[PDB]
Amino acid sequence: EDTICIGYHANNSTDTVDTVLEKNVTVTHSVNLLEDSHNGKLCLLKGIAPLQLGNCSVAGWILGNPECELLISRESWSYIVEKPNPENGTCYPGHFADYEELREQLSS
Amino acid sequence: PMDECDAKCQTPQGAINSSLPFQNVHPVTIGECPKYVRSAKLRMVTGLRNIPS
Amino acid sequence: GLFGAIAGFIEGGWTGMVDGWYGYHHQNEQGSGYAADQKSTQNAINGITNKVNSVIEKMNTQFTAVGKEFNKLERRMENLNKKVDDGFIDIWTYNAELLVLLENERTLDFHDSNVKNLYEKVKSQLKNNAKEIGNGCFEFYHKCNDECMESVKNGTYDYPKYSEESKLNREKI
Amino acid sequence: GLFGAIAGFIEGGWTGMVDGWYGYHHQNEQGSGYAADQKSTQNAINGITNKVNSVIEKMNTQFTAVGKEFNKLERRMENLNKKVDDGFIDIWTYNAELLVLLENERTLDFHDSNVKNLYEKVKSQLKNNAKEIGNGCFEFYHKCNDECMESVKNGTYDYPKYSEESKLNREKI
Amino acid sequence: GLFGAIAGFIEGGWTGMVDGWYGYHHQNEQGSGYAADQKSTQNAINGITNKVNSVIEKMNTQFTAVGKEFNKLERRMENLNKKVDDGFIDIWTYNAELLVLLENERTLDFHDSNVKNLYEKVKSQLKNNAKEIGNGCFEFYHKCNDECMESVKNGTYDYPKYSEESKLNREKI
Ligand SMILES: *[C@@H]1O[C@H](CO)[C@@H](O[C@@H]2O[C@H](CO)[C@@H](O)[C@H](O)[C@H]2NC(C)=O)[C@H](O)[C@H]1NC(C)=O
Ligand SMILES: *[C@@H]1O[C@H](CO)[C@@H](O)[C@H](O)[C@H]1NC(C)=O
Ligand SMILES: *[C@@H]1O[C@H](CO)[C@@H](O)[C@H](O)[C@H]1NC(C)=O
Ligand SMILES: *[C@@H]1O[C@H](CO)[C@@H](O)[C@H](O)[C@H]1NC(C)=O
Ligand SMILES: *[C@@H]1O[C@H](CO)[C@@H](O)[C@H](O)[C@H]1NC(C)=O
Ligand SMILES: *[C@@H]1O[C@H](CO)[C@@H](O)[C@H](O)[C@H]1NC(C)=O
Ligand SMILES: *[C@@H]1O[C@H](CO)[C@@H](O)[C@H](O)[C@H]1NC(C)=O
């Protein structure tokens, strides 16, 4: 004869969480809060370009190393780009005091 | 590599989607950015449990 | 089934219906079928929207520059700034992780409570006119058409409709 | 009405009574009126007091001096101390805001649960002797005076008092 | 008794049984005794284990060196590093303390809910065949042996067993 029942949703899904009372806990729908990924690119802010040094040091950039493009046209930019191990330090070596401080002052 | 693409947050490992609150990816960032953790994952539930029978 | 249904008196969920997270399954002479409860479902999902907006937006992301660097004649500032940053990182990590665990727990409780409420709504009309059966379902001592289904969804039954049919078809049992 | 009453089977609240947050409304031949449940009400409000004491006091406010200032030859310390302070400010902000939202949610659940409990207490005495009606109320198959009201408030009925009057006045229905 | 039992319809606990946190008390002609519900008890305790693992492990403790020291010509760094460290200390303190209070609250609610669920499980079999009594207990209009006890524990009754004995021994009442 006739019958009424409750009902609710399930699916084929197997996305999972951890939870206080059980782990790998399966649900239908989820949402990843995290941005676990990176595009592996050096994009630019907002339409504002960054500064690039290529191979140069900050010393080779600021001082006028001819192997470093001076780039007076670069009036302002989004952020500074280097490599970790910059090639072209000073062709005539010498101490460069407060390198840190000048970097932080030229942070922006 | 350097690219013409645009962003709102950036790090050496890549340019970053500034939509979400968090990464676990690398602490160093510049811009309108997430915050770093030392973790694998964070996934809030929207739905609920799945059991067929 | 914190509050008694899902892994409670109910064992499991159903894959047939997809339009909304909750509903009923109707069974009558015309046939069988599933049909979703968009009222409470949409109310709940509005709650989830207001949650996740009230999780993401509560951050304030500055136009930031993270990193620094130092000489070896300022290890004070180096090991400090390490400890400082790692302190922050760990605190956000801990608070955030507990928030995900607890919020998903409260989401399970939110769902569980909503279905339990609806089960009481279904019961509230059909108390003596129709009986509990098994789990998850009520059997009628009378008969019910699709109009009766649609009525019982939106909080309408008209109690004296099949009061007497239930009052007689009970009495063999 | 997380647990089924307030925006649940109950639709709304009442402005007439002010002495305590909960109570009953009595209806009998002598008249109508509202009367507050100071027992559970005061128990709950003691809970709220212990909450807010256990929110405010858990801070420890030092005899503090916040600010600093620097030259332009220590932008490291400037932009650092900016990031440091803003980091703290944001973390307190986030944790605090989530605490207000969640605590008020749990306060709604606290109230909802207390009234639901009391509804079960009212039901537990008067199960067969008197019936559910509508929502929020029970009708008696017998009659009840102010002594009966005051008895049923404090957890007393004496079940065989009107057992028979209910057992006969049911039977027309 | 947030959800209605413990300091609710139940007044207090019992010291006789120790093998598991929950159970039943059986009363029949063979005698009296207590017996524990290891199913739901162990399920819950697995939950508590997963909690406390998910509290302790969510810390990450570095191979750390806490302290520093300074001259009096760097009071900036002194009073800073004081404020920095005290800031961290207070934030961990506040978050941790709220976590202990709230987690123990949710533990009480977890227990309360589990027993309430089980009370509904006990009721679900024996609805008309046996009655509510007092609080915490159901009286049978029929008789029940240790096999009947052990059956009713694991979610088995066979409803038509004593349906008729209840259907007749009711009728004097
Ligand atoms: C940056 O450094 C690399 C070194 O790897 C330079 O690479 C040289 O490029 C020239 C052509 O431009 C070749 O003739 C050399 O054989 C390359 N050497 C190596 C080791 O790769 C690169 O040119 C430098 N770029 C700038 C802009 O300075
Ligand atoms: C589950 O269903 C969704 C939607 O049809 C689909 O995207 C997904 O690939 C399916 N997964 C499996 C394992 O069938
Ligand atoms: C989840 O963890 C439980 C722990 O016992 C295990 O039984 C189950 O196989 C796990 N499932 C997956 C998909 O990892
Ligand atoms: C950024 O994230 C949002 C939300 O996840 C997504 O809609 C968008 O496509 C993403 N964009 C890129 C470029 O990753
Ligand atoms: C409820 O459903 C019935 C049909 O089952 C319909 O006549 C009535 O208008 C509906 N009411 C509302 C408020 O939707
Ligand atoms: C409860 O109320 C009745 C009257 O309604 C009174 O006789 C009795 O003493 C009261 N008991 C308590 C404990 O207040
Ligand atoms: C439940 O207990 C009964 C006896 O009391 C036994 O016959 C039955 O096999 C048990 N079932 C399970 C699933 O343990």
mmCIF file with all atom_site columns, N, CA, C and O in Angstrom, chain C residues 7 18 28 30 32 46 51 57 60-62 72-73 77 84 92 96-97 105 120 124 130 137 142 144 149 158-159:
data_model
loop_
_atom_site.group_PDB
_atom_site.id
_atom_site.type_symbol
_atom_site.label_atom_id
_atom_site.label_alt_id
_atom_site.label_comp_id
_atom_site.label_asym_id
_atom_site.label_entity_id
_atom_site.label_seq_id
_atom_site.pdbx_PDB_ins_code
_atom_site.Cartn_x
_atom_site.Cartn_y
_atom_site.Cartn_z
_atom_site.occupancy
_atom_site.B_iso_or_equiv
_atom_site.pdbx_formal_charge
_atom_site.auth_seq_id
_atom_site.auth_comp_id
_atom_site.auth_asym_id
_atom_site.auth_atom_id
_atom_site.pdbx_PDB_model_num
ATOM 1   N N  . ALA C 1 7   ? 23.528 7.451  9.805   1.00 0.00 ? 7   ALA C N  1
ATOM 2   C CA . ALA C 1 7   ? 24.175 6.415  10.615  1.00 0.00 ? 7   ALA C CA 1
ATOM 3   C C  . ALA C 1 7   ? 23.524 6.301  11.985  1.00 0.00 ? 7   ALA C C  1
ATOM 4   O O  . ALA C 1 7   ? 24.200 6.015  12.980  1.00 0.00 ? 7   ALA C O  1
ATOM 5   N N  . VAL C 1 18  ? 19.152 14.330 -7.402  1.00 0.00 ? 18  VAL C N  1
ATOM 6   C CA . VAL C 1 18  ? 20.291 15.235 -7.539  1.00 0.00 ? 18  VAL C CA 1
ATOM 7   C C  . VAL C 1 18  ? 19.897 16.709 -7.536  1.00 0.00 ? 18  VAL C C  1
ATOM 8   O O  . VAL C 1 18  ? 20.780 17.564 -7.399  1.00 0.00 ? 18  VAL C O  1
ATOM 9   N N  . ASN C 1 28  ? 3.118  5.556  -4.199  1.00 0.00 ? 28  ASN C N  1
ATOM 10  C CA . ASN C 1 28  ? 1.679  5.368  -4.284  1.00 0.00 ? 28  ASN C CA 1
ATOM 11  C C  . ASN C 1 28  ? 1.372  4.530  -5.523  1.00 0.00 ? 28  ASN C C  1
ATOM 12  O O  . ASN C 1 28  ? 2.282  4.067  -6.220  1.00 0.00 ? 28  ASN C O  1
ATOM 13  N N  . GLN C 1 30  ? 0.191  5.287  -8.391  1.00 0.00 ? 30  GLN C N  1
ATOM 14  C CA . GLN C 1 30  ? 0.683  5.852  -9.636  1.00 0.00 ? 30  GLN C CA 1
ATOM 15  C C  . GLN C 1 30  ? 2.138  5.493  -9.889  1.00 0.00 ? 30  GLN C C  1
ATOM 16  O O  . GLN C 1 30  ? 2.552  5.434  -11.053 1.00 0.00 ? 30  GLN C O  1
ATOM 17  N N  . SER C 1 32  ? 6.398  5.234  -8.071  1.00 0.00 ? 32  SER C N  1
ATOM 18  C CA . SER C 1 32  ? 7.434  5.627  -7.133  1.00 0.00 ? 32  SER C CA 1
ATOM 19  C C  . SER C 1 32  ? 8.165  6.837  -7.693  1.00 0.00 ? 32  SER C C  1
ATOM 20  O O  . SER C 1 32  ? 8.142  7.101  -8.898  1.00 0.00 ? 32  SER C O  1
ATOM 21  N N  . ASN C 1 46  ? 21.832 28.716 1.631   1.00 0.00 ? 46  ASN C N  1
ATOM 22  C CA . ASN C 1 46  ? 22.044 30.126 1.935   1.00 0.00 ? 46  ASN C CA 1
ATOM 23  C C  . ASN C 1 46  ? 22.888 30.278 3.188   1.00 0.00 ? 46  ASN C C  1
ATOM 24  O O  . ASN C 1 46  ? 23.755 31.161 3.269   1.00 0.00 ? 46  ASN C O  1
ATOM 25  N N  . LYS C 1 51  ? 28.243 31.347 5.457   1.00 0.00 ? 51  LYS C N  1
ATOM 26  C CA . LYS C 1 51  ? 29.409 30.842 6.162   1.00 0.00 ? 51  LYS C CA 1
ATOM 27  C C  . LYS C 1 51  ? 30.648 31.208 5.374   1.00 0.00 ? 51  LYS C C  1
ATOM 28  O O  . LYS C 1 51  ? 31.444 32.021 5.842   1.00 0.00 ? 51  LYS C O  1
ATOM 29  N N  . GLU C 1 57  ? 36.133 36.335 3.705   1.00 0.00 ? 57  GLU C N  1
ATOM 30  C CA . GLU C 1 57  ? 36.192 37.789 3.795   1.00 0.00 ? 57  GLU C CA 1
ATOM 31  C C  . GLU C 1 57  ? 36.763 38.273 5.120   1.00 0.00 ? 57  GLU C C  1
ATOM 32  O O  . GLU C 1 57  ? 37.187 39.427 5.224   1.00 0.00 ? 57  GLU C O  1
ATOM 33  N N  . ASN C 1 60  ? 41.963 39.804 5.954   1.00 0.00 ? 60  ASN C N  1
ATOM 34  C CA . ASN C 1 60  ? 42.330 41.036 5.264   1.00 0.00 ? 60  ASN C CA 1
ATOM 35  C C  . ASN C 1 60  ? 43.755 40.885 4.756   1.00 0.00 ? 60  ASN C C  1
ATOM 36  O O  . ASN C 1 60  ? 44.703 40.822 5.545   1.00 0.00 ? 60  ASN C O  1
ATOM 37  N N  . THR C 1 61  ? 43.897 40.823 3.441   1.00 0.00 ? 61  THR C N  1
ATOM 38  C CA . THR C 1 61  ? 45.177 40.593 2.783   1.00 0.00 ? 61  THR C CA 1
ATOM 39  C C  . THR C 1 61  ? 45.771 41.934 2.377   1.00 0.00 ? 61  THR C C  1
ATOM 40  O O  . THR C 1 61  ? 45.238 42.613 1.493   1.00 0.00 ? 61  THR C O  1
ATOM 41  N N  . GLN C 1 62  ? 46.873 42.312 3.015   1.00 0.00 ? 62  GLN C N  1
ATOM 42  C CA . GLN C 1 62  ? 47.539 43.555 2.674   1.00 0.00 ? 62  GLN C CA 1
ATOM 43  C C  . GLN C 1 62  ? 48.344 43.414 1.393   1.00 0.00 ? 62  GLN C C  1
ATOM 44  O O  . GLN C 1 62  ? 48.688 42.315 0.953   1.00 0.00 ? 62  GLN C O  1
ATOM 45  N N  . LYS C 1 72  ? 75.565 38.088 8.361   1.00 0.00 ? 72  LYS C N  1
ATOM 46  C CA . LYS C 1 72  ? 75.861 37.199 9.476   1.00 0.00 ? 72  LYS C CA 1
ATOM 47  C C  . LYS C 1 72  ? 76.257 37.939 10.753  1.00 0.00 ? 72  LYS C C  1
ATOM 48  O O  . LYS C 1 72  ? 76.429 37.286 11.785  1.00 0.00 ? 72  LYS C O  1
ATOM 49  N N  . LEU C 1 73  ? 76.395 39.271 10.717  1.00 0.00 ? 73  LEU C N  1
ATOM 50  C CA . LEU C 1 73  ? 76.571 40.087 11.916  1.00 0.00 ? 73  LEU C CA 1
ATOM 51  C C  . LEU C 1 73  ? 75.246 40.577 12.499  1.00 0.00 ? 73  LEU C C  1
ATOM 52  O O  . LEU C 1 73  ? 75.254 41.440 13.385  1.00 0.00 ? 73  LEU C O  1
ATOM 53  N N  . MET C 1 77  ? 68.699 39.313 14.506  1.00 0.00 ? 77  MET C N  1
ATOM 54  C CA . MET C 1 77  ? 67.553 39.585 13.657  1.00 0.00 ? 77  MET C CA 1
ATOM 55  C C  . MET C 1 77  ? 67.225 38.404 12.761  1.00 0.00 ? 77  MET C C  1
ATOM 56  O O  . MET C 1 77  ? 66.058 38.220 12.404  1.00 0.00 ? 77  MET C O  1
ATOM 57  N N  . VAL C 1 84  ? 59.820 34.595 14.630  1.00 0.00 ? 84  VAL C N  1
ATOM 58  C CA . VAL C 1 84  ? 58.684 35.484 14.467  1.00 0.00 ? 84  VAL C CA 1
ATOM 59  C C  . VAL C 1 84  ? 57.771 34.911 13.393  1.00 0.00 ? 84  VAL C C  1
ATOM 60  O O  . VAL C 1 84  ? 56.591 34.613 13.646  1.00 0.00 ? 84  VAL C O  1
ATOM 61  N N  . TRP C 1 92  ? 48.485 30.623 12.553  1.00 0.00 ? 92  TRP C N  1
ATOM 62  C CA . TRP C 1 92  ? 47.484 30.563 11.494  1.00 0.00 ? 92  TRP C CA 1
ATOM 63  C C  . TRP C 1 92  ? 47.163 29.126 11.130  1.00 0.00 ? 92  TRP C C  1
ATOM 64  O O  . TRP C 1 92  ? 46.006 28.784 10.870  1.00 0.00 ? 92  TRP C O  1
ATOM 65  N N  . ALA C 1 96  ? 43.493 27.701 11.802  1.00 0.00 ? 96  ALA C N  1
ATOM 66  C CA . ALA C 1 96  ? 42.815 27.356 10.564  1.00 0.00 ? 96  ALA C CA 1
ATOM 67  C C  . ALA C 1 96  ? 42.415 25.894 10.529  1.00 0.00 ? 96  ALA C C  1
ATOM 68  O O  . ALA C 1 96  ? 41.294 25.568 10.134  1.00 0.00 ? 96  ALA C O  1
ATOM 69  N N  . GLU C 1 97  ? 43.303 25.009 10.963  1.00 0.00 ? 97  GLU C N  1
ATOM 70  C CA . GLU C 1 97  ? 43.032 23.583 10.875  1.00 0.00 ? 97  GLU C CA 1
ATOM 71  C C  . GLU C 1 97  ? 41.912 23.182 11.814  1.00 0.00 ? 97  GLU C C  1
ATOM 72  O O  . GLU C 1 97  ? 40.986 22.448 11.425  1.00 0.00 ? 97  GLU C O  1
ATOM 73  N N  . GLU C 1 105 ? 32.430 19.608 11.212  1.00 0.00 ? 105 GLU C N  1
ATOM 74  C CA . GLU C 1 105 ? 31.652 18.907 12.223  1.00 0.00 ? 105 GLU C CA 1
ATOM 75  C C  . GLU C 1 105 ? 30.306 19.583 12.422  1.00 0.00 ? 105 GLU C C  1
ATOM 76  O O  . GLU C 1 105 ? 29.251 18.940 12.377  1.00 0.00 ? 105 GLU C O  1
ATOM 77  N N  . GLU C 1 120 ? 10.375 15.633 12.161  1.00 0.00 ? 120 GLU C N  1
ATOM 78  C CA . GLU C 1 120 ? 9.342  16.047 13.098  1.00 0.00 ? 120 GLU C CA 1
ATOM 79  C C  . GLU C 1 120 ? 8.203  16.779 12.405  1.00 0.00 ? 120 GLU C C  1
ATOM 80  O O  . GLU C 1 120 ? 7.051  16.664 12.839  1.00 0.00 ? 120 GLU C O  1
ATOM 81  N N  . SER C 1 124 ? 4.376  15.592 12.551  1.00 0.00 ? 124 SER C N  1
ATOM 82  C CA . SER C 1 124 ? 3.468  16.461 13.287  1.00 0.00 ? 124 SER C CA 1
ATOM 83  C C  . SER C 1 124 ? 2.072  16.460 12.683  1.00 0.00 ? 124 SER C C  1
ATOM 84  O O  . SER C 1 124 ? 1.076  16.598 13.403  1.00 0.00 ? 124 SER C O  1
ATOM 85  N N  . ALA C 1 130 ? -1.341 7.950  10.540  1.00 0.00 ? 130 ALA C N  1
ATOM 86  C CA . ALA C 1 130 ? -0.391 7.098  9.847   1.00 0.00 ? 130 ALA C CA 1
ATOM 87  C C  . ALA C 1 130 ? 0.741  6.802  10.813  1.00 0.00 ? 130 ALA C C  1
ATOM 88  O O  . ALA C 1 130 ? 1.011  7.589  11.724  1.00 0.00 ? 130 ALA C O  1
ATOM 89  N N  . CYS C 1 137 ? 10.629 6.195  7.148   1.00 0.00 ? 137 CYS C N  1
ATOM 90  C CA . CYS C 1 137 ? 9.395  6.171  6.376   1.00 0.00 ? 137 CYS C CA 1
ATOM 91  C C  . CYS C 1 137 ? 8.206  6.026  7.312   1.00 0.00 ? 137 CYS C C  1
ATOM 92  O O  . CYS C 1 137 ? 8.323  5.508  8.428   1.00 0.00 ? 137 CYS C O  1
ATOM 93  N N  . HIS C 1 142 ? -4.370 4.936  5.040   1.00 0.00 ? 142 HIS C N  1
ATOM 94  C CA . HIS C 1 142 ? -5.231 5.426  3.977   1.00 0.00 ? 142 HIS C CA 1
ATOM 95  C C  . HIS C 1 142 ? -4.375 5.521  2.725   1.00 0.00 ? 142 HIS C C  1
ATOM 96  O O  . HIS C 1 142 ? -3.254 5.000  2.716   1.00 0.00 ? 142 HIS C O  1
ATOM 97  N N  . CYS C 1 144 ? -2.933 8.059  -0.707  1.00 0.00 ? 144 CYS C N  1
ATOM 98  C CA . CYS C 1 144 ? -2.400 9.396  -0.933  1.00 0.00 ? 144 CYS C CA 1
ATOM 99  C C  . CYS C 1 144 ? -1.985 9.540  -2.391  1.00 0.00 ? 144 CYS C C  1
ATOM 100 O O  . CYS C 1 144 ? -1.228 8.713  -2.909  1.00 0.00 ? 144 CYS C O  1
ATOM 101 N N  . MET C 1 149 ? 0.747  14.316 -1.761  1.00 0.00 ? 149 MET C N  1
ATOM 102 C CA . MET C 1 149 ? 2.194  14.430 -1.606  1.00 0.00 ? 149 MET C CA 1
ATOM 103 C C  . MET C 1 149 ? 2.599  15.896 -1.572  1.00 0.00 ? 149 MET C C  1
ATOM 104 O O  . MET C 1 149 ? 3.237  16.349 -0.614  1.00 0.00 ? 149 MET C O  1
ATOM 105 N N  . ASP C 1 158 ? -4.715 18.916 6.134   1.00 0.00 ? 158 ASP C N  1
ATOM 106 C CA . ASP C 1 158 ? -6.144 18.853 6.451   1.00 0.00 ? 158 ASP C CA 1
ATOM 107 C C  . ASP C 1 158 ? -6.471 17.532 7.151   1.00 0.00 ? 158 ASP C C  1
ATOM 108 O O  . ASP C 1 158 ? -7.010 16.606 6.534   1.00 0.00 ? 158 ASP C O  1
ATOM 109 N N  . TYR C 1 159 ? -6.046 17.439 8.422   1.00 0.00 ? 159 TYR C N  1
ATOM 110 C CA . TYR C 1 159 ? -6.240 16.311 9.350   1.00 0.00 ? 159 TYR C CA 1
ATOM 111 C C  . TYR C 1 159 ? -7.542 15.519 9.233   1.00 0.00 ? 159 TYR C C  1
ATOM 112 O O  . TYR C 1 159 ? -7.469 14.283 9.234   1.00 0.00 ? 159 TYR C O  1
#
